[PDB]
Each structure stands twice: as structure tokens, then as C-alpha cells.
Amino acid sequence: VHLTPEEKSAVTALWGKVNVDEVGGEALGRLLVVYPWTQRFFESFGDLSTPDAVMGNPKVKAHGKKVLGAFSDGLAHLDNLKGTFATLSELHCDKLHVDPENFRLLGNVLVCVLAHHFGKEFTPPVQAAYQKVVAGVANALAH
Amino acid sequence: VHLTPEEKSAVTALWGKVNVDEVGGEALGRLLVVYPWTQRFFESFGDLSTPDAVMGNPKVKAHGKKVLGAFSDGLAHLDNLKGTFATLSELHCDKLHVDPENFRLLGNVLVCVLAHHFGKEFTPPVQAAYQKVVAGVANALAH
Amino acid sequence: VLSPADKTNVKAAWGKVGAHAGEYGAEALERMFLSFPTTKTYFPHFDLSHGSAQVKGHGKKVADALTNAVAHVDDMPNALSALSDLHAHKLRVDPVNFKLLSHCLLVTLAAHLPAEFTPAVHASLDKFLASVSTVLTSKY
Amino acid sequence: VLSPADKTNVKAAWGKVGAHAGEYGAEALERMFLSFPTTKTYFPHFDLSHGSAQVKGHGKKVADALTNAVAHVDDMPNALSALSDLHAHKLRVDPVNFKLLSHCLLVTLAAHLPAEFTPAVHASLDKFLASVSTVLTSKY
Ligand code: HEM
Ligand code: HEM
Ligand code: HEM
Ligand code: HEM
């Protein structure tokens, strides 16, 4: 990762304005719409056929709130990501059997959601910092 | 990685019968034939247009001999791969600017070359051990 | 691959882009250069400044190629023949770089069309940019 | 995508396979299951033994589908329509798993055709298995 302190100020300063509920479930719902094979991992969440029932499924919104809980824990622990996501890399790579490419996909989807909620406030250096964060979280879950 | 001692006996026992010169240059030449965009990194090696001038290029043979030098150093250091390939991950990721996906490709190509030189001697457990080795070397060069 | 509903969302989305194509393609190249720095090695002759001239003109030329890919959405291997011979034979671009720019294009649209970028439009534009990236690597 | 020289190498290579297709496809599934264990989660109802019966029958069925893909090498989206509706809609297979099996198929051929597996045949069969993997994910 190794964010410069200006990039830590842009990550922290932009993340302090992130609504939890919309960005989490919106990001996971955009996985399940854009990348539909990921829907084989969420077979218990009821309807995931139509995109409007993906973006209105309450379990996708609550689970996405859990996912931004984990990204928030990743942003409070930018040096010890390998230490932080060890339980979650065990859960995603030992119990759930998720191929780690998918984690990268969710990270990129999250970045799209961030642009979708910030526009001109989401500059290419802010995006570069969030690609370092996203690749840090994906590589941290890759164990 | 974490090879079981039977898989260490199959990796070591099969690797002790590997000719250096054919397997190295054959593996790199099969990168430059099967995955032609990799030929943008070897623009100084003369002719790499036709596959027979890829598989007869002496610089591809000597450079592939260096590549199996690095895999041999990787097999003598199965626990400290992150320590062993630090100079080569600096050289491939700081000077040459190789996207780490390519390393995975060479590893798979090497496994194909191993099958091409061993046949029924290259069983699915031997291949499983060499996929652990290949993914260890690729992840070790990914820094 | 692309359904007529996906072609509806792609042609509608680039229709909502319109004349800002050079600014959005220049924005997307600045995002790819600044966030994914190894792609800077494909441009050893440009000034890769944060708002340069060759980055902006090359962004306009990339987005003109994308607009001709929208107007030829079912004729992509023949309307993008010189570019697929360019990026695969002459420049020899690693295909995963075509993923990265595609991502930055989506980010650019998400940074500039905050009303039109529904998840059906996100999925349709992702299929579109993966299809253009498939055509531009199809000489491999 | 596939040149007639590549179709020559693919039809020549599966011609040299012949009647050993069920053994080679069963071999390739055993290689994918034993080397890449997460693909075992797609088969929660098989006995995934080292030489089982459902692994061998499913290897025969995979290789029959590949043989019909060879005989329909320019008619792949219509000869593999039920399978592409199977793997994308019903089973929802991650597309990178279609890379892994493709790799194991090459390893199987390299373990069993040591004379016919030239780098032109390796490149042609890699284009073929990437094209079959492209058709089998084309309902995404
Ligand atoms: C890349 C960053 C990711 C983060 C930070 C993340 C976060 C989490 C967390 C914190 C949990 C635990 C939920 C709990 O304990 O209640 C979880 C579970 C889960 N994750 Fe992820 N995840 C990521 C990627 C993915 C991806 C890409 C997929 C699927 C394609 C996925 C599929 C799942 C599933 C199926 C569960 C279990 C659902 C459940 O227990 O109800 N995850 N994830
Ligand atoms: C597991 C994969 C790989 C290993 C173990 C490996 C190993 C090596 C070694 C030992 C060297 C020579 C360093 C020296 O002489 O000081 C080298 C250099 C180089 N590698 Fe790799 N390599 C790998 C993958 C790749 C791939 C996939 C590519 C290209 C797509 C690549 C491109 C190069 C180039 C261009 C050089 C420099 C050539 C030169 O100095 O003449 N390498 N690598
Ligand atoms: C994804 C869609 C892309 C499109 C539509 C596109 C389009 C173009 C166009 C229109 C040109 C100018 C050539 C001409 O006018 O005939 C060009 C050149 C070029 N492209 Fe792309 N491109 C794409 C992706 C990429 C990517 C991902 C890279 C590198 C990582 C790249 C690297 C280059 C380079 C190096 C040139 C040559 C620049 C020059 O000659 O000055 N392109 N491309
Ligand atoms: C080139 C690649 C492949 C081909 C040609 C192929 C072909 C087939 C065929 C012929 C069937 C049986 C359809 C029938 O019942 O008539 C099938 C089913 C199936 N395939 Fe594939 N397949 C490929 C790749 C994969 C991969 C990579 C996976 C998983 C990682 C996979 C998982 C499955 C599963 C789970 C079934 C369900 C059949 C059962 O379990 O009873 N396939 N495929």
C-alpha cells in the first residue's frame, strides 16, 4: 500500500463522507449485476435474478454494510492488513472457496461506486490512493 | 507453497531429471509463441516473428537457461521464496515493468514443457506439487 | 454478446456523453496513468502531465475510436481493424492493460454521469468495454 | 480468430487423440481437481476419487463436447448453446475456472502426445480452448 500522507488525507477525507448503507449494498449489488457468476455465492439471499431485485434485496444491503465494515477496518489498519484480514481470508479462501480474482472485481466495483457518489470530488490522485487500498485489501484476502 | 514430503520427493525426484538447456529455452520460446505480447519485452533478441526463429533464437535459449537457474534457486529455497526472488521481483517490477499475470503464464508454460518431457512420469500429484511451486514463484515475484 | 437492451444502454450512455468525449477519454487516460503506472511504459514519447496536450489529444482519439465502436456496435471486428492490427502487432499491448483502461473509463463515466449510470448501464458498458478490448486483442 | 492453419493444428491434434478422448478428459479433470482444489466445489455430488467412475464419465462427456467443438470449429456459439446456457445460467461457473481446465487439457495433451505438441500446436490449442472457454461464458 504505502500511501503518502497527502493520499492518506484524501483517503481519510473522502472516506469520512461515505454513507455506509448506500455504498456497501450498492457495491455488492453491482457485483451481482455486472459479474453474475458471483451470484452463485449468495444463493441463500432469495431473489437475485433481476437487477432491481438485486438492488432492493435487504440481505445484499446488510451484507454490503458488513463489507464496508471490513473496508473501514482496512482503512484503520493500513499497515497491518495481512494481520487484519486473516480471519476473512480464512473465511473466503477456506470455507467459501472464492477464487481471489473476484476480490479484485469487488474492489474495482467499489471504486466505481465511489466515483458515482463523488464525481469531481473523486480526482485521479484520490482514485490512485483507493486503487492502492483496493489492491491492498484484495492481496490481504489472498492467502 | 508448503509441499508435503512426498510432494517434495516428487518435485526433487522429477527435477533431478530435467535437462536445463531444452526446458528453459523451450519454456521461454513457448511464451513468445503462445503469448505474443510478451515479445515486447524481448525486442533486443533479434528475430521473434516466426515460431521457428523463436525456438532457434540463441538468446531465448540462454535466457531461458537463466530462468531455470531462477527456478532451481526457487526449489532449493522453498521456504524463503520471498527472500530469494527479491532482486528479481525488483528487476521485473521496477525496471522492466512486467504485469505479474505474465509470470503466472510462464509458470503454466513451464508445467506444459515438463509434461512434454515426462509424459506418464508427470502424474496429477506431481503436477499439483509443481502448481504449488509455480504459484509460489509467481507470487514471490509479485512485489 | 450485447443484447439490444445493452446496446440501448451503451448508445444512450455515449449519447449522454456527446461532445465531452475528448475530456472524458483524456480524464480516463490520466486515471490510468496516475493509478496504474506501468501503462506509462507504453507511452515513452509523451509528456504524461496532469493535463497535458498529447494526453488530451490521445484521449480525444481513443474516445473517437470508442464512438465509432458505438455506432458500429455489431460491426466491431471490421470497424476496429486498423486498431487491432496496431495494438496487437505493432505495439504488442498486454491484454490485461485493456482491462485497466476499461475500468478507468467506467470510473470516468461514474464521475461525470451520476444519473445515467445505473447498474444496467454499468453492466452494459462493462460488456461493451470488454467487447472492444476483445476486438483490440483479437489479432493475438 | 482461429486461422485455417490453427484449425489444421487443432483438427490434427484431436485427430491424433481419437478414441482416447474419454481417458484424456478424465485425466484433465483429475488434474484440475487435484491441482486446483476449489473446482471441487462445483462437483458436490461426485465421488472425486483418483480414478473414479463419475469423473471418467464426465471426462468422456467433456471431451465429446470438445470433439463436437472441433467438428464445429467455426460454428461454436450454436453447437455449444445448451452448454453455454448450462455453465453460465444454471451452474454459474467463474470464468477463470475455464482457464484452469484449459491449462490442464494442454498438460494432458503434453503428457500424451509428445510428438504432435509443437509450439504451433500449443498456440493453436490454446487459442481453441480460450475460444471454447469464451463461448461457454458468452451468456454472461
Ligand atoms: C474484496 C473485499 C471483500 C471484503 C472486504 C469482504 C468482506 C466480507 C465480510 C466481513 C464477511 C463476513 C460477514 C459476516 O461475518 O457476517 C464476508 C462474507 C462473505 N463474503 Fe465477502 N468480502 C469481500 C469480497 C467478497 C467477494 C468478491 C465475494 C463473492 C464473489 C464475497 C462473498 C462472500 C460471502 C458469500 C460471504 C458469506 C455471506 C454470509 O455469511 O451470509 N466476498 N465478506
Ligand atoms: C516465474 C517467472 C520468471 C522467472 C523465474 C524469471 C527469471 C528471470 C531471470 C533469472 C532473469 C535474469 C536476471 C539477470 O540476468 O540478472 C530475468 C530477466 C528478464 N525477464 Fe524474467 N523471469 C520470469 C518471468 C518473466 C516473464 C513472464 C517475462 C516477460 C513476459 C520476463 C521478462 C524478462 C526480461 C525482459 C528480462 C531481462 C532480459 C535481459 O536482461 O536480457 N520474465 N528473469
Ligand atoms: C480500450 C480501448 C482503446 C482504444 C479504443 C484505443 C484507441 C487508440 C487509437 C484511436 C489510437 C491512435 C491510432 C490511430 O489514430 O490510428 C491508439 C494508439 C495507441 N494506443 Fe490505444 N486504445 C485503447 C486502449 C489502449 C490501451 C489500454 C493502451 C496501453 C496500455 C493503449 C496504448 C496505445 C498506444 C501506445 C498507442 C500509440 C500512441 C501513438 O502512436 O502516439 N491503447 N489507440
Ligand atoms: C472447455 C471447458 C468445458 C467443457 C467443454 C465442458 C463441458 C461440459 C459437459 C459436456 C457437461 C455435461 C452436460 C450434460 O449433462 O449433457 C458439463 C457439465 C458440467 N460442467 Fe463443464 N465443461 C467445461 C468446463 C467446466 C469447468 C471449468 C467446470 C468447473 C470448474 C465445469 C463444471 C461443470 C459441472 C458442475 C457440470 C454439471 C454436470 C454434473 O455435475 O452432473 N465445466 N460440462
Author numbering:
A (entry chain B), B (entry chain D): 1 to 143
C (entry chain A), D (entry chain C): 1 to 140
The authors write:
Here, we expand upon our previous results and show that biological specimens amassing <100 kDa can be resolved to better than 3 Å resolution using similar imaging approaches. The resulting reconstructions possess well-resolved density for bound cofactors, metal ligands, as well as ordered water molecules. We further demonstrate that conformational heterogeneity in specimens of this size range can be discerned. All specimens in this study were imaged using a base model (i.e., excluding imaging accessories such as a phase plate or energy filter) Talos Arctica TEM equipped with a K2 Summit DED operating in counting mode using the Leginon13 automated data collection software.
Khoshouei et al. recently demonstrated that a TEM operating at 300 keV combined with a Volta phase plate (VPP) and quantum energy filter could be used to resolve human hemoglobin (Hb), a ~64-kDa heterotetrameric heme-containing protein, to ~3.2 Å resolution. We therefore sought to determine the structure of Hb using similar strategies. Briefly, vitrified Hb specimens were prepared from lyophilized human Hb (Sigma Aldrich). UV-VIS absorbance measurements of the solubilized Hb sample confirmed that the bound heme was indeed in the ferric (Fe3+) oxidation state, hereby referred to as methemoglobin (metHb). RELION reference-free 2D classification yielded detailed class averages exhibiting secondary-structural elements and various recognizable views of tetrameric metHb. Three parallel 3D classifications were performed to select for unique particles comprising the best-resolved classes across each classification. Local resolution estimates indicated that most of both maps were resolved to better than ~3.5 Å, which is consistent with our ability to resolve side-chain densities throughout the maps. Our ability to discern subtle conformational differences in a target as small as 64 kDa effectively underscores the utility of this approach in examining the conformational dynamics of similarly small biological systems. Moreover, the results of our work with ADH and mHb demonstrate that small-molecule ligands and discrete conformational states within a single sample, respectively, can be resolved using conventional SPA even for smaller complexes.
